[PDB]
Design a protein around this nucleic acid. Structure first.
Ligand SMILES: [Ca+2]
Length: 579
DNA sequence: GCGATCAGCG
DNA sequence: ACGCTGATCGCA
């Protein structure tokens, strides 16, 4: 039905200075994936190009790389990274419909052009699932069907830029889109394509030793149970723990007994088997997720892994990382933390450099709540996580172990995000009356934080949503629910989303400023990863001293709050050693 | 496919 | 009965 030119070659009217562009990559993981077709829509008409001709045409390649030739797209990072794997640079992306829809409403779950278009009553385009199919039936349709679908997606983007930009402007989000999310998308594309080199010899050797240790722990388990059984079957595990050994039942799931790590730690005084089970799960988690799982996604020729940073997924404005997830590599236990020895620089005589914001969300909270005592604490550069551990465990600063500080950390965030006295009691193995009175003492020291929690909930009720410092938005319809439990979850979102989301705004701006500064200084240093409030770079070892001065300062000056921001940083031969 | 579990970030 | 995630695994 929709008219377009099925081109056999590239003509000049296809190369206008504004166009909607579709560069179609059907595989979910777009690294090194086929480009199946290209569509262009501009003032001169609608065009479909086969990639084998468009991407070898020197005028089309120059047009793609000309930043003054402006393109509107959906998920331009998918396109940009797929084009890098074809050796082609995409520049000039001035509107991204995926990122525009994400800002307007992250809960929509927009995953293709049709779902974005539906937000503005535009329905002249089919969902990608209807054209390609689902699961094992996924297939590229034949050329006529493929080309009409790509042209319809391009025409939708063409028509939708203005009504999306208009609503972004009304929401105070247009500069958020155009100066933050869209430049960040090109930086993530570079990070994803650079990848992270992995020491596969050391990883495989760890995997060998691990399997030997797994079998040993597994036999002490069978010997402590007096019998063999399946350690990962809840049924058989419940029989050993709760019927055979007759341990107390502290917690049930919807399917039966709970055996989560918090339950098993509480059972450790009763029987030695439960701590062996914990060691066994931890060893097994490393093997399946961080050894085997990681080797499966290493590209063998370069020994690099290439994550995908989902930039339009989380409800707070955070990124997520997938296949592999490089944002949850073990660190807390020494056995798992050794995994990070396998992440190495991509050139000899380069180093890994890591920089991290200190107590980022509490500094953001101090600023947003304008709490006098919390603002003073950070103006003194106090370590609030350590101070809370001193108070909890009634020890001195010199005696705070890494674990107590990590514990107190869950206490600080738990309290400001609405933990109940019950929840706090369970978390610390203390009484519920002592839990409630600790919480009341905590808000007596920080009355501005308490006022803020009450006020933000009220504002969410009035407005129907909450916002972050850079005007990211999250709608909270459940805030006025008749159901107490549904309303309560919404109130804790109203307490947490402005703080976590503002911390996400800040590090994103820091990344944009960092990239610009590295380029102005003509350094080879470049970002590899973001881990929510941490940035990880690699660079020639001769740039490290300049990075020690440049990176902390760029991150600390990304925004100006009522308290200082503070950055810790380390560098070394591996990711393990950058700490 | 989902729920439980557990790895990270706060 | 703090929040935000992704990968794995058994299936009660
Ligand atoms: Ca931090």
């Amino acid at each position: 039905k929709m008219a377009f030119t099925l081109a056999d070659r590239v003509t000049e009217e296809m190369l206008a200075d504004k166009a909607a562009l579709v560069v179609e990559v059907v595989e979910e993981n777009y690294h090194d994936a086929p480009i199946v077709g290209i569509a262009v829509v501009n003032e001169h008409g609608r065009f479909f190009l086969r990639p084998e001709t468009a991407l070898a045409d020197p005028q089309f390649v120059a047009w793609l790389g000309d930043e003054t030739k402006k393109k509107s797209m959906f998920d331009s990072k998918r396109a940009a990274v797929a084009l890098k794997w074809k050796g082609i640079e995409l520049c000039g992306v001035s509107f991204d419909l995926l990122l525009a829809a994400y800002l307007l409403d992250p809960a929509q779950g927009v995953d293709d052009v049709a779902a974005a278009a539906k937000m503005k009553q535009y329905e002249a385009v089919r969902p990608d699932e209807a054209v390609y199919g689902k699961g094992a039936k996924r297939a590229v349709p034949d050329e006529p069907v493929l080309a009409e679908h790509l042209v319809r997606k391009a025409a939708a983007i063409w028509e939708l830029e203005r009504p999306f930009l208009d609503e972004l402007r009304r929401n105070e989000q247009d500069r958020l889109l155009v100066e933050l999310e869209q430049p960040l998308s090109s930086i993530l594309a570079e990070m994803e394509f650079a990848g992270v080199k992995v020491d596969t010899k050391r990883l495989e050797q760890m995997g060998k030793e691990l399997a030997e240790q797994l079998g040993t722990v597994e036999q002490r388990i069978y010997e402590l149970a007096g019998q063999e059984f399946n350690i990962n079957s809840p049924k058989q595990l419940g029989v050993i723990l709760f019927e055979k050994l007759q341990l107390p039942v502290l917690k049930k799931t919807k399917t039966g007994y709970s055996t989560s790590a918090d339950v098993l730690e509480k059972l450790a005084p009763y029987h030695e088997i439960v701590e062996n089970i914990l060691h066994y799960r931890q060893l097994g988690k490393l093997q399946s997720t961080y050894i085997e799982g990681l080797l499966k996604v290493v590209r063998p020729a370069t020994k690099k892994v290439h994550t995908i940073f989902n930039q339009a997924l989380t409800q707070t404005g955070r990124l997520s990382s997938t296949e592999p997830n490089l944002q949850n590599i073990p660190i807390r236990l020494e056995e798992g933390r050794k995994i990070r020895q396998a992440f190495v620089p991509s050139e000899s005589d380069w180093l890994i450099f890591a920089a991290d914001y200190s107590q980022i969300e509490l500094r953001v909270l101090a600023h947003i709540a304008e709490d006098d005592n919390l603002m003073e604490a950070f103006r003194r550069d106090l370590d609030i996580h350590t101070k809370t551990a001193m108070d909890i465990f009634q020890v001195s600063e010199d005696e705070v172990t890494p674990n107590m500080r990590r514990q107190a950390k869950a206490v600080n965030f738990g309290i400001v995000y609405g933990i109940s006295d019950y929840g706090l009691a369970q978390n610390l193995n203390i009484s519920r009356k002592e839990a409630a009175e600790f919480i009341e003492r905590y808000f007596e020291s920080f009355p501005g934080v308490k006022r803020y929690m009450e006020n933000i909930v009220q504002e969410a009720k009035q407005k129907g949503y909450v916002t972050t410092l850079l005007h990211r938005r999250r709608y909270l319809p459940d805030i006025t629910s008749r159901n107490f439990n549904v309303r309560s979850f919404a109130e804790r979102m109203a307490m947490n989303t402005p703080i976590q989301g503002s911390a996400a705004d800040i590090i994103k701006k820091a990344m944009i400023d960092l990239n610009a500064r590295l380029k102005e200084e003509r350094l080879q240093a470049h970002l590899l990863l973001q881990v929510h409030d941490e940035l990880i770079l690699e660079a020639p070892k001769e740039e490290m001293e300049r990075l020690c001065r440049l990176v902390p300062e760029v991150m600390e000056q990304a925004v100006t709050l009522r308290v200082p921001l503070k950055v810790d940083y380390h560098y070394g031969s591996t990711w393990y050693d950058a700490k």
